[model samples]
Target chain A: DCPPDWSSYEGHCYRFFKEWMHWDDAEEFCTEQQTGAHLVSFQSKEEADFVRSLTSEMLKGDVVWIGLSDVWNKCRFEWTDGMEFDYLIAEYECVASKPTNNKWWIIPCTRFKNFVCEFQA
Target chain B: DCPPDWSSYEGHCYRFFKEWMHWDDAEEFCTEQQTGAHLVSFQSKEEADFVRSLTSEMLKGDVVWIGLSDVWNKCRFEWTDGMEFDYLIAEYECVASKPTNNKWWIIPCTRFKNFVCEFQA
Candidate 1:
């Protein structure tokens, strides 16, 4: 089936996991359990907001890790696909939520939080 | 000349004003004085951050209106160009900065503050 509870958009499937995990563990869960899927990536405004809208109401005012990180090079970020990082919010790394808090924040990767997972449709 | 201190990016020009005014007046000033310019609009994440990076260091901790507002219909925003709102913050009507506040926040239109203006290059 189409990954139970996962929604499809723009040629990909997404699932928002309410369980908490540090940034690294979240990526591992996506890759290991979700059939090689990774955390969500925003290649365009539509894609970014689509992911944002899928967030759970219970997670409001909280953070949900996406597939952005600079662990390999502080202040430099990349997607799992290795495409050159395109979005710029200089001086920060990692992206999260609280859409009211401006939706995506630069946060420390060590922090634990729920996360959104995505993969090819 | 391109216009004093106006920075060029991605085929457009941008300027940040320290002056304060309600959202409507600020848009008026941009359209009238800057050759049909409008408040800043983020068609892409890169564009949004490019404008954010140009903000004066002096504006930190303060908000600067961008070219987004739901003045025509509360909670339903549109760029000056009349493009339907593409971002989904769910319940905000305006956008402001604190790039650290996730770089953008939904705000009220009547509140007065500084703003960023943009024009074609």
Candidate 2:
């Protein structure tokens, strides 16, 4: 994948979807657009907080598309960043309004949702 | 790259390096082990703190192997995560003792250092 040239804030990759799509469609679109990129994954409260701020302002209402999903194993979601699940909440279940929380519900990669593209420079 | 399979912590992907290595070796080992994976990048203060905690104990004195380097363009380093470098300190310089800081030093991928693996799974 080519190196991303947009914005990189607080050690997190931030990319605008530009258009709306389902979780699966967005995931695939991101993959194609980014040559293998997918939704973003949160790692820290600051990152989450930043994402929350961005989502709060950028995202319409529903959650934004992150590199998370139960595609491989339902209820056992993972991020493309490839880190073990360890946060205030470890389980893959979805939660609301928890800035400290790092996990999100699984959505199809093809579904349309704003996503961030990631790659090693 | 094949989707990583193992642990997914708080939307971040985690992998362990059984043996100790330099920043460069570690990064390469990670890439070979996980195909195209590289050192882990910090996205949030929590993530930074998490990496900090891991590096505090896991790392000896120097920094661990993250997918950060001035490979393509010196001073214009980037992470394999493909996201632009956007941490609290985004200029791509070195800082000391700041858990809130997400940006890290640029080490050669060939350097031996503890690294984190990432994938699409």
Candidate 3:
């Protein structure tokens, strides 16, 4: 079962934060929230879509940070949990989903944005 | 989303059947219920535990059939849906979990019992 303020889906718990923060800061906050927590990463379209629905109230430009970054290897994305797994857009390092379509986009890791956190149930 | 009469958990849809049925009959019924349906299989302790929670109304003796059997090879268990994935007792071919503690038991495939049906989301 998920904790208070978190939603359960698949085998993970997710929480959407309306507060804007840089991707790394958001990821840090998620870590402080719990062990193994991190910015959410996608493994399947269904999962990404579910994440989209979880944050449906946000506006188009209010893209929420997802746990994905090519900072380690340019153009080579990775999940914080090491769940071995993309969607595309701008040629930046960090990944966020546009609220309008939940389609992923690469953006500056330092850009402040709303984010979602995820962890195993 | 799961179909009506079914509960959504993790990434799958589950339905509990109160009607008694043999292991094979229940399996056939699940297959008819959906394209990728099965009698349910355990991938982890968490998953098996969740399955137990899904069928909370039955009594101790009213064990529910899960998708597991060694009919082809003695003691070699296999899931009906083959999710690329057990508990023990009796050394029989079919497996079912008692509602009292949700612990698994091996029984003859022809014995009638309540069963749970499962499929992907």
lDDT (tens digit, per residue) of candidate 2 on A35-75: 54566556666666665544433534445666554333343
lDDT of 1: 0.71
**Which wins on DockQ, candidate 1 or candidate 3?**
1
Q: How do the residues A1-121 of candidate 1 rate in per-residue lDDT, one tens digit apiece?
A: 4567888897898888887776767888989866869998777777767777777544466778888875324455668986786741321236676544436776655456888888885
Q: For candidate 3, what is the DockQ?
A: 0.01
Candidate 2 TM-score, C-alpha based: 0.32
Consecutive 10-residue window with the lowest summed lDDT within model 1 chain A:
A86-95
In terms of docking quality, model 1 is incorrect
Looking at model 2, residue A7 earns an lDDT score of 51
lDDT string, candidate 2, B1-121, tens digits:
2244445657656665535554444556667766456666656567655655444344444445555553433545578999888531121221123222444554323233445554433
- Runs in model 1 with CA error above 4 Å? A71-93, B1-121
TM-score of chain A of each: 0.73, 0.52, 0.78
Q: What residue pairs are clashing in model 1?
A: B99-B103
- Measured against the true two-chain complex, the DockQ scores of the candidates, in the order shown, are 0.01, 0.01, 0.01
RMSD of 3: 21.3
